[PDB]
Design a protein around this ligand. Structure first.
Ligand SMILES: CC(C)(COP(=O)(O)OP(=O)(O)O)[C@@H](O)C(=O)NCCC(=O)NCCS
Ligand SMILES: CC(C)(COP(=O)(O)OP(=O)(O)O)[C@@H](O)C(=O)NCCC(=O)NCCS
Ligand SMILES: CC(C)(COP(=O)(O)OP(=O)(O)O)[C@@H](O)C(=O)NCCC(=O)NCCS
Ligand SMILES: CC(C)(COP(=O)(O)OP(=O)(O)O)[C@@H](O)C(=O)NCCC(=O)NCCS
Ligand SMILES: CC(C)(COP(=O)(O)OP(=O)(O)O)[C@@H](O)C(=O)NCCC(=O)NCCS
Ligand SMILES: CC(C)(COP(=O)(O)OP(=O)(O)O)[C@@H](O)C(=O)NCCC(=O)NCCS
Ligand SMILES: Nc1ncnc2[nH]cnc12
Ligand SMILES: Nc1ncnc2[nH]cnc12
Ligand SMILES: Nc1ncnc2[nH]cnc12
Ligand SMILES: Nc1ncnc2[nH]cnc12
Ligand SMILES: Nc1ncnc2[nH]cnc12
Ligand SMILES: Nc1ncnc2[nH]cnc12
Lengths: 163, 163, 163, 163, 163, 163
């Protein structure tokens, strides 16, 4: 047929069960799925880029056609670097639709030949917010329903270290 | 790489410039794109299924990896019949999001291993409504900005015949 | 300054307190406000066009710079006929946004030099649905909170006549 | 404490797993939950009112504090008749929000002392559309993931009878 | 009947007329309404928790079945502590729906037997934003249409003190 | 006819092609269009007010009936100062609708006789986000598709100076 590489970009602070489900689904469609972890300095992420990469690799490493890579520059440049024809984003019934469609429209100007394609996670992950996950973890609450056990370990350790 | 077939289903009453742009974009990603024209009896389409197939074939025939086919039954069965792993739908900033996400969620129960993926047409087609196109044509207004010339011809002829 | 005519188009089946408030507000801004009552045959209106014009004239006649006129063709043609530079539409927090933005976008193709401008009625009218008004009236319920007394009279008489 | 009766009104054409989950949840909060099945003549329901009542009673009869009753008039009057202080509606991420908030706002005028309260079904039922359920059943597709077995039986029998 | 306690949680920075209306409505339905004022450290509230509690007590103290209490931990724990079966939230036509449904869905995992129920304030309070209230007060503008006189006094004093 | 002044207020950090299109459209309708650049201290703008005024004047100066003015206080006061009867805002399919309708509703309390009117930019500018423009510029990416060349120059110089 053809070889199609897709990029699934995000801050992934941290990778949730929603993100993992999207990776499972997208990697079943595309020949290679590149999970692009953006530095996202201005968003003031809880975990460092190095930490977010380790967290994501722990969860996703077993998928044979998934690559986890960080990037500090423009998504445009990361997509081109990976010879990607598709940007995959998760879209849920409770997504920030304004944000998603603005990004897709602007990336459409920056990368006219690259398609943004939206996929949907399983029903049970449709309502997970990363911001709320971090809030719960910081207040000492368990987030096991929302993130994998390995990710819980990172949250617990980071919360304890910052105190 | 792999051979991935996608289905782009719709009533296509008639095929608009928005639909055509989605076909152009989707057929650039997938090895084969099957445009599935649903009979949609209960929706009381303006054009018959035979007519909608002719209209769509006139516009889309030149695309070498696009197949236009009608179906009178369940989308589930049409997808399986075409060995398709993806259902492509257009999503625009003004889409019926309730409708799209309900269909995707229910098809998720009917076809757990098939992914609904949403794509976006060019900015200039984001606001075209087929219902409004038919309304304009029936009142004798030109719809050339919204549909291809071949489709305009069908609308004009059908409007004249029904009077 | 300048002379600016705006058109406020609708089916007005019947004119509600929400519509009247929009007319009051729009007529305070524009030199002339033309209330365009569309025949809307395909929508199967409860009141005939002649009736909808009488209903609207009863409520709006006192406004010195408001003209109520029917039309059976394209809005494009009605706007041009009235030398209008603006199409006014009501936008409420519970509007059919898909519908409104599709119409505005398509009218933008049909009438590039005419601006669709959205105005908001008072809080107390933001949730009035004409469809629900007709439903209540047909089941013999009072709609005085939603329409003016003159309009109530028309609803009562039409409901009684159809039985 | 207090005795609070709530009404859960709908067309219920037919009762789905989403509706049943809402009944389970609402009946756990309120002393009595009255499921009000509206005749909804103008909506042209697939099942008659008598049929919709039988369908709902089959599914809901086992709940000791749930009453299933039909009504042919105004919801206002049905609520007052049942001494209800609350109207419960399901709200899902894919609800017709325009419709729900218009109804709540208008019922607020009709019944100022009655509160419309929105509840959410389980994630797995958030995307079920009754319209799509009927469409699938009419095309001979199984809807067991969306409705209870007793309801499937009614759909099958009605579809067979209408052919 | 039964004794049902509901919690109405929020940052309440400060309590607005919208919040007060929701308390009035909710306390008419539930046997006890607990207004839970979250510390919300990360949100960087304008008023301290102690101040927000005083502000809310001044407005709400007269309601005989309303309790105002602060909390520094998880909502889950506060709900359980108060033996509450319901979390009440205000939902307006201009609510952050993404945020509300994410919280409800995640609390559904944390507290499966507790129902999030959404209520609607009066039309006249549907468009009040606390963020905009604080912005106006900080720029020396009157917010009496949006908050009670006692709350205005707190805003004025805090604005003057911070300068 | 009449002399109608409208205010188009914003932070304009910086003025984008979307804003410019709205100014072009609004200034064709109103006798005078005042572009009000709010200090917006709390939003922590990238450009100072003086800079944002220079940026906007460079782009908009050629429009004979457009005035660009800064303000540090309440919009209410700026509107009254300019004898304005209309506040114009851009509304796009991807707007923050919550934010826009809250502002309009609250300004409706502050300025009952002033109408907020929403206008729509051309399709090609509907998806431009100022936040994303700043993000791209800070990462050294070209934003020429989103802002005028003069504005690009300001972004480049400010980015270089802050490093
Ligand atoms: C990181 C990304 C993809 C946004 O992702 P996000 O919404 O934080 O992902 P999340 O982890 O929430 O799923 C976006 O900000 C991005 O692409 N950043 C890189 C810089 C860039 O190219 N910006 C222009 C985007 S149009
Ligand atoms: C036809 C289709 C795809 C809806 O398409 P549509 O929204 O009319 O497409 P449009 O032409 O408007 O782009 C849908 O109704 C469908 O799949 N119909 C076939 C019967 C079926 O399987 N229904 C269950 C859908 S979950
Ligand atoms: C009638 C109108 C304005 C829609 O109004 P509406 O939403 O029914 O108005 P309502 O009475 O609900 O406020 C629209 O259907 C129209 O313009 N009809 C005339 C024919 C036409 O030109 N159609 C193309 C619209 S892009
Ligand atoms: C039937 C009802 C509740 C709408 O329900 P629905 O959305 O069809 O319910 P569904 O079965 O889809 O869950 C509504 O149309 C109604 O109340 N009808 C009775 C007549 C009436 O009072 N109408 C005024 C409603 S404000
Ligand atoms: C405070 C609350 C309820 C959000 O309220 P809010 O939207 O700030 O309320 P407002 O005052 O705007 O009406 C929420 O952040 C919360 O529950 N915080 C406590 C910590 C917690 O349990 N977080 C998990 C929420 S799923
Ligand atoms: C600046 C403004 C108009 C918001 O604009 P904005 O959304 O930042 O505009 P943008 O540049 O994004 O187009 C608003 O915050 C404002 O009016 N600020 C002045 C102070 C004020 O009066 N606030 C009350 C607003 S109801
Ligand atoms: N729960 C979730 N599922 C998929 N994509 C997401 N992006 C953010 N949250 C998500
Ligand atoms: N204009 C449009 N573009 C893409 N898909 C669509 N589906 C319906 N209208 C569409
Ligand atoms: N209540 C209302 N107010 C203004 N415009 C409307 N259009 C339809 N309903 C309306
Ligand atoms: N799936 C569903 N769940 C709850 N309420 C509903 N109303 C309509 N569909 C529903
Ligand atoms: N105005 C308002 N009314 C009710 N709940 C709210 N939550 C935030 N603002 C609100
Ligand atoms: N692209 C855009 N067009 C018009 N108004 C806007 N406000 C913010 N972004 C805008």
């Amino acid at each position: 047929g053809s070889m199609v590489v897709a990029v699934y970009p995000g801050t992934f602070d941290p990778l949730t069960r929603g993100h993992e489900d999207l990776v499972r689904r997208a990697s079943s469609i595309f020949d290679t799925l590149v999970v692009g972890v953006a530095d996202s300095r201005a968003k003031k992420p809880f975990f460092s880029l190095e930490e977010r990469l380790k967290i994501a690799n722990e969860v996703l490493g077993h998928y044979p056609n998934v690559k986890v890579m960080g990037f500090t520059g423009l998504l445009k440049d990361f997509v081109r670097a990976n010879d990607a024809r598709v940007i995959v984003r998760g879209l849920r019934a409770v997504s920030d639709f304004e944000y998603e469609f603005q990004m897709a429209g602007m990336n459409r100007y920056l990368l006219p030949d690259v398609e943004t394609m939206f996929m949907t996670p399983s029903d049970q992950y449709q309502f997970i917010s990363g911001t709320i996950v971090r809030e719960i973890a910081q207040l000492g609450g368990d987030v096991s329903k929302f993130v994998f056990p390995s990710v819980e370990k990172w949250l617990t350790e980071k919360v304890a270290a910052m105190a």
